[PDB]
Amino acid sequence: REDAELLVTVRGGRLRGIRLKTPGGPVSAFLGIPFAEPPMGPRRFLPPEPKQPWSGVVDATTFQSVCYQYVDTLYPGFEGTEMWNPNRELSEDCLYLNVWTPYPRPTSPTPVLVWIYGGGFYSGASSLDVYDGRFLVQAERTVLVSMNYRVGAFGFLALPGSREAPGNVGLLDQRLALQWVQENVAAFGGDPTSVTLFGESAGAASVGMHLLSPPSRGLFHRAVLQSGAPNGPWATVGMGEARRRATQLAHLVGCPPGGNDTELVACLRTRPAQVLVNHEWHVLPQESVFRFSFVPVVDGDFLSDTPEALINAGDFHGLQVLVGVVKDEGSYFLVYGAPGFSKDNESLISRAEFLAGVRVGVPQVSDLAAEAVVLHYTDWLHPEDPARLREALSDVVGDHNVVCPVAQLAGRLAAQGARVYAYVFEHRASTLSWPLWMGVPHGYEIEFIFGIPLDPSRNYTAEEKIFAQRLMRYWANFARTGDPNEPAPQWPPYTAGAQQYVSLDLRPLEVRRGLRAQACAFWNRFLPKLLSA
Amino acid sequence: DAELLVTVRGGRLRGIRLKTPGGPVSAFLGIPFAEPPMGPRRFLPPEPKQPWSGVVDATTFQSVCYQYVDTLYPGFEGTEMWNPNRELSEDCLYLNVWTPYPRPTSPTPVLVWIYGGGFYSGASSLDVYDGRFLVQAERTVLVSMNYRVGAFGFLALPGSREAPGNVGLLDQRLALQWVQENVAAFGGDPTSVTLFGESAGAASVGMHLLSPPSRGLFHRAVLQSGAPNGPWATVGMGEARRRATQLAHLVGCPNDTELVACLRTRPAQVLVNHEWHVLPQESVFRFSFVPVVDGDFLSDTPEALINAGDFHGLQVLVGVVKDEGSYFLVYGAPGFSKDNESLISRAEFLAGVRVGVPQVSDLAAEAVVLHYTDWLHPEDPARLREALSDVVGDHNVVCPVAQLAGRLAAQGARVYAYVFEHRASTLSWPLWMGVPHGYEIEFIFGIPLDPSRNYTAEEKIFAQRLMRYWANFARTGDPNEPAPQWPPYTAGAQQYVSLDLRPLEVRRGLRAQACAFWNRFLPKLLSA
Numbered sequence A: 001r002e003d004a005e006l007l008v009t010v011r012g013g014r015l016r017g018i019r020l021k022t023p024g025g026p027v028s029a030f031l032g033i034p035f036a037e038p039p040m041g042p043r044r045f046l047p048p049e050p051k052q053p054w055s056g057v058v059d060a061t062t063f064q065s066v067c068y069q070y071v072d073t074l075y076p077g078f079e080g081t082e083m084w085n086p087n088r089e090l091s092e093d094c095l096y097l098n099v100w101t102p103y104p105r106p107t108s109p110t111p112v113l114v115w116i117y118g119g120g121f122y123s124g125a126s127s128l129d130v131y132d133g134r135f136l137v138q139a140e141r142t143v144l145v146s147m148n149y150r151v152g153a154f155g156f157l158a159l160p161g162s163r164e165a166p167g168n169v170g171l172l173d174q175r176l177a178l179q180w181v182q183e184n185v186a187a188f189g190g191d192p193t194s195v196t197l198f199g200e201s202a203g204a205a206s207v208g209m210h211l212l213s214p215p216s217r218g219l220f221h222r223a224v225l226q227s228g229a230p231n232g233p234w235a236t237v238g239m240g241e242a243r244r245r246a247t248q249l250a251h252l253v254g255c256p257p258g259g260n261d262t263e264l265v266a267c268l269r270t271r272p273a274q275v276l277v278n279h280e281w282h283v284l285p286q287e288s289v290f291r292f293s294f295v296p297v298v299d300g301d302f303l304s305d306t307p308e309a310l311i312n313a314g315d316f317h318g319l320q321v322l323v324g325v326v327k328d329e330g331s332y333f334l335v336y337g338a339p340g341f342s343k344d345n346e347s348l349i350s351r352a353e354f355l356a357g358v359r360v361g362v363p364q365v366s367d368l369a370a371e372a373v374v375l376h377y378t379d380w381l382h383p384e385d386p387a388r389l390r391e392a393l394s395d396v397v398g399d400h401n402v403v404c405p406v407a408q409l410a411g412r413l414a415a416q417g418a419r420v421y422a423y424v425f426e427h428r429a430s431t432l433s434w435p436l437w438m439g440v441p442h443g444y445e446i447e448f449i450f451g452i453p454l455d456p457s458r459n460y461t462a463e464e465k466i467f468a469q470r471l472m473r474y475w476a477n478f479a480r481t482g483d484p485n486e487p488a489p490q491w492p493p494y495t496a497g498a499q500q501y502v503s504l505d506l507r508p509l510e511v512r513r514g515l516r517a518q519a520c521a522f523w524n525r526f527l528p529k530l531l532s533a
Numbered sequence B: 001d002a003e004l005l006v007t008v009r010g011g012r013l014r015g016i017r018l019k020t021p022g023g024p025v026s027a028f029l030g031i032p033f034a035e036p037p038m039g040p041r042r043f044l045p046p047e048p049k050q051p052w053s054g055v056v057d058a059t060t061f062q063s064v065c066y067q068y069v070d071t072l073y074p075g076f077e078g079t080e081m082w083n084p085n086r087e088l089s090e091d092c093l094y095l096n097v098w099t100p101y102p103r104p105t106s107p108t109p110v111l112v113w114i115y116g117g118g119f120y121s122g123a124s125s126l127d128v129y130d131g132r133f134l135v136q137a138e139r140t141v142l143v144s145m146n147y148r149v150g151a152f153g154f155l156a157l158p159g160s161r162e163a164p165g166n167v168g169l170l171d172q173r174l175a176l177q178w179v180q181e182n183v184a185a186f187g188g189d190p191t192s193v194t195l196f197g198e199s200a201g202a203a204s205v206g207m208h209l210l211s212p213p214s215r216g217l218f219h220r221a222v223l224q225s226g227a228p229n230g231p232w233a234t235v236g237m238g239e240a241r242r243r244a245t246q247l248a249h250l251v252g253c254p255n256d257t258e259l260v261a262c263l264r265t266r267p268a269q270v271l272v273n274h275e276w277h278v279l280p281q282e283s284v285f286r287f288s289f290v291p292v293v294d295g296d297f298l299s300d301t302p303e304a305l306i307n308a309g310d311f312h313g314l315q316v317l318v319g320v321v322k323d324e325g326s327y328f329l330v331y332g333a334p335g336f337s338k339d340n341e342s343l344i345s346r347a348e349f350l351a352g353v354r355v356g357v358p359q360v361s362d363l364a365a366e367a368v369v370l371h372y373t374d375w376l377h378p379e380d381p382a383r384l385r386e387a388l389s390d391v392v393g394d395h396n397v398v399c400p401v402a403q404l405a406g407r408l409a410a411q412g413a414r415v416y417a418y419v420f421e422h423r424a425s426t427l428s429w430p431l432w433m434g435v436p437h438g439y440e441i442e443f444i445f446g447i448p449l450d451p452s453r454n455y456t457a458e459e460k461i462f463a464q465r466l467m468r469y470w471a472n473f474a475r476t477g478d479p480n481e482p483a484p485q486w487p488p489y490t491a492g493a494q495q496y497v498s499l500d501l502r503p504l505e506v507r508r509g510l511r512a513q514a515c516a517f518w519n520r521f522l523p524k525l526l527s528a
């Protein structure tokens, strides 16, 4: 007849899941649980409203649709890019979440891990194979939750002040899912008093904004920010620039036939989703990399102030945070606009291409600011060495967009009462499809965190599987106790003075100092002073 | 002794025979080359010395031009060696000639020394400028002149004829013209004149390179720890007028004519006593009365003239010591002294940056702090003491010299660069100062050869090797012995040699990272 372990009642009604096969053992999975009414038609650009109760049993037996988003076409059929592309049908009916739990269901409350995918706030899906939660759940016996949230214009087009397009609705999607976790995760055996948020890139930036937003802060207890921070120059936008991009997007699709917000939004709602996707990138002020059209907006509501101001003025006592980056944060983004770069050659650029790439990698700054960047990243004993220039531009984009925003956040949190653990992921996967000059690119620690190497269908080495099991143990130890160390080389906390972090690779843990302290002093201390003058 | 009797165009001279460990040399000290710039001739360009009857006694050094005397460490050898060793006087325009004994009968290459001292001090009579060892060992003619310093040499009311400015530079040029007309009477070759100078003397050498009326009076140049494009070497017309105007107010004097007239009534010591209170702020390596850019001696700023110049056919020898700035820190940087380790704090370091980099915006100062802070050890006292010494040294000497060398080389000049890294065993300064500013001169003049001093046997050999380098360059434009070789400095390779007891070691980059900051970025920041 029926299996009781796959039947759960939540506030909205009854659910039916599936028993998932993993190499280590069975897993209960509830995939495609609706947590909000479909944000379609008149509900486009609007905040999510809760899913109204249902009669009967909802089959939560497979991943639901991917929120409508752009699909990468630079390298068609290439494994390195297709792994991030939608693996389900695109639709605006996309607000569903997923719950993995041990089989049989835990009888005592179990710590919960909530995943927020990244993708520059314009892409991503909880259904990607690299976000498969069955291995983490089986190996460490946690409850893992992941949700879909609206991306691109559908999630972050903002006409600030208007009620028809208030902005930040993609973040409200995440917040609603976190509220769903608080009310319902105990029915799956999860502990709502021990909820750990973790995400990568825009997901990590999202995690940080929930830390800084009081209505979200009460919904979790710990945070993990991988290769992303809310104080990044790409993660937020001002109210005026948000309105300019929304108005230009509407102008590019025939709305109005700016002016009035109500008529302008209503005209945008009549446009097919693909039409908005096709023009969303034409609203960027200049050609750039690591810049996204529609991102969270600082409008005094979700973010009372800029993330940097909230970070500096925040009291973080009672909070544990795990932060980190990969070894080569910037390499991936260079083949998407930096002159002379491609994955199919070694991208040994000239001095002129380096100087031109600086303006692409650091867009919308004065020529004096660009000169400061050139001065700091040029080796004046080898000013035109093609190799050194290629690595330097990669460091420019990586430090400016990831490493130094993360370091600044970690330093301010530790100084203001939070316990911080920092890492640098340095293992290049044996199966990595990207060229070797890219090193360890953005986002390629995720598959090890989720235990993907234990998939028998894939071809990781036996040592990479032990590495994956060790990383899953770190993450789950942090979720359980706020400490990645086991109750063995120790992982010391990160503090603003010593600035200690660990290397994550096949070798045992190695303690180092300084997350590129010299470079990050330029980005976090001096260059803001230069932009003010 | 006919070897000590010489007739120049002005009249007859009587010299003196000196002794060296390698034999005797002929010396002619206190030769007048200008009319005494006293009374109504104060602040005025030098007049050629009128011919005289009888025999001028040229057997001892003449008076030192009126200048400030350091009193921070009274009786301390490290400072007394630079203080005047003859009486002070405005009657001070005399030069000295050293020749081999007996006098050369064939044209001999000529070395012309221009002393340093921030354009406010210095004298050709100092013991460390004794030319007898160079002349004996390398058989050259050596000339050194006294030139007016301080307000007497560089007070300027631009546009006026009573204080035109740069008259101390014109003193040097007049001595160079004197060499062209009279050095052959001593056996010297006026067609082979090499200028060499240290600190403000090196800056003066550079300015003679950039001034056409002086450019034809010599053929080669040596710039030691100084450059004409230094932030201290020149001053604008507006600031020169302000500094001169405040000096008159400080000494009780009121129109340029009425103002210079009142300054000319003041005793020389009075102007000396107030010369440093006209500086705009508390600082180090900043001097009140320096050459002014007024379109005459310098038709443009030295850095502009450097960039626009064709320097083909020119050979220069440039260099620095290992620790250019450490010396200046004990004259105003908070927390520094020669009598303790000077392990300063972060707060003193930040305060010392404003003293070491005076008269720049807060943003420019923050850029300095960023580049010279180790953000892994931001408060380490030993690293901060080292860093502030590099700030003063790079900004004032190393990077101005690196800029001049790179531009000259890339524009036709053959450049040889060095770093002097030997600390003298007799050095009285504390060990944390390393090799301070000016402490390569005694080795180039071969002072270690003096048996009355306590240099080592290897230091004597080292001094002989340095005199050979300098004299080779004076003779051929190439310091190399016709080892390993001393390669030329180029804008790309940036090759220089280290000078110490070890054989020559070739290295790349004169603090290339720090000098890109000072020479490339900071000018853009201050103008934006």
Ligand SMILES: *[C@@H]1O[C@H](CO[C@@H]2O[C@@H](C)[C@@H](O)[C@@H](O)[C@@H]2O)[C@@H](O[C@@H]2O[C@H](CO)[C@@H](O)[C@H](O)[C@H]2NC(C)=O)[C@H](O)[C@H]1NC(C)=O
Pocket (backbone or CB within 6 Å): A337, A338, A339, A340, A341, A342, A344, A345, A346, A347
């Ligand atoms: C390295 O690759 C870049 C990118 O070029 C693309 O990828 C290459 C692998 C090859 O397939 C090219 O044909 C592709 O266009 C090269 O830069 C491009 O050069 C071409 C020709 O000069 C020019 O038309 C493009 O605009 C350039 N693109 C960019 C982004 O600069 C680069 O020259 C290659 N380096 C080599 C071959 O040494």
Ligand SMILES: *[C@@H]1O[C@H](CO[C@@H]2O[C@@H](C)[C@@H](O)[C@@H](O)[C@@H]2O)[C@@H](O[C@@H]2O[C@H](CO)[C@@H](O)[C@H](O)[C@H]2NC(C)=O)[C@H](O)[C@H]1NC(C)=O
Pocket (backbone or CB within 6 Å): B333, B334, B335, B336, B337, B339, B340, B341, B342, B343
């Ligand atoms: C190293 O010395 C400096 C200054 O030299 C001292 O000056 C006299 C006080 C003398 O008696 C000797 O100590 C030294 O020659 C010290 O900095 C001074 O500190 C005093 C207080 O002790 C203060 O009043 C002065 O302003 C400071 N001077 C300057 C130029 O800033 C410094 O403390 C000494 N370093 C130590 C003791 O570690």
Ligand SMILES: NC(=O)c1cc[n+](COC[n+]2ccc(/C=N/O)cc2/C=N/O)cc1
Pocket (backbone or CB within 6 Å): A070, A071, A072, A084, A122, A123, A277, A278, A279, A280, A281, A290, A332, A333, A336, A442, A443
């Ligand atoms: N809506 C659009 O037309 C659009 C959206 C986003 N991009 C940027 O996409 C290129 N890009 C640039 C950089 C990355 C880096 N990822 O780590 C990934 C990708 C591709 N993602 O699908 C271009 C156009």
Ligand SMILES: NC(=O)c1cc[n+](COC[n+]2ccc(/C=N/O)cc2/C=N\O)cc1
Pocket (backbone or CB within 6 Å): B068, B070, B120, B272, B273, B274, B275, B276, B277, B283, B284, B285, B286, B327, B328, B331, B332, B437, B438
């Ligand atoms: N006339 C004055 O009062 C006067 C003149 C010159 N100084 C210079 O004295 C300080 N000083 C003394 C000696 C040196 C020696 N440097 O090698 C350098 C410096 C430089 N900057 O402060 C001070 C006062």
Ligand SMILES: *[C@@H]1O[C@H](CO)[C@@H](O)[C@H](O)[C@H]1NC(C)=O
Pocket (backbone or CB within 6 Å): A457, A458, A459
């Ligand atoms: C692993 O490699 C083998 C080699 O033939 C192949 O059969 C298999 O499909 C590969 N797996 C993946 C996930 O690429």
Ligand SMILES: *[C@@H]1O[C@H](CO)[C@@H](O)[C@H](O)[C@H]1NC(C)=O
Pocket (backbone or CB within 6 Å): B452, B453, B454
């Ligand atoms: C060293 O030389 C000095 C003169 O420079 C002399 O006074 C002294 O007697 C010598 N010996 C010692 C031990 O200092």
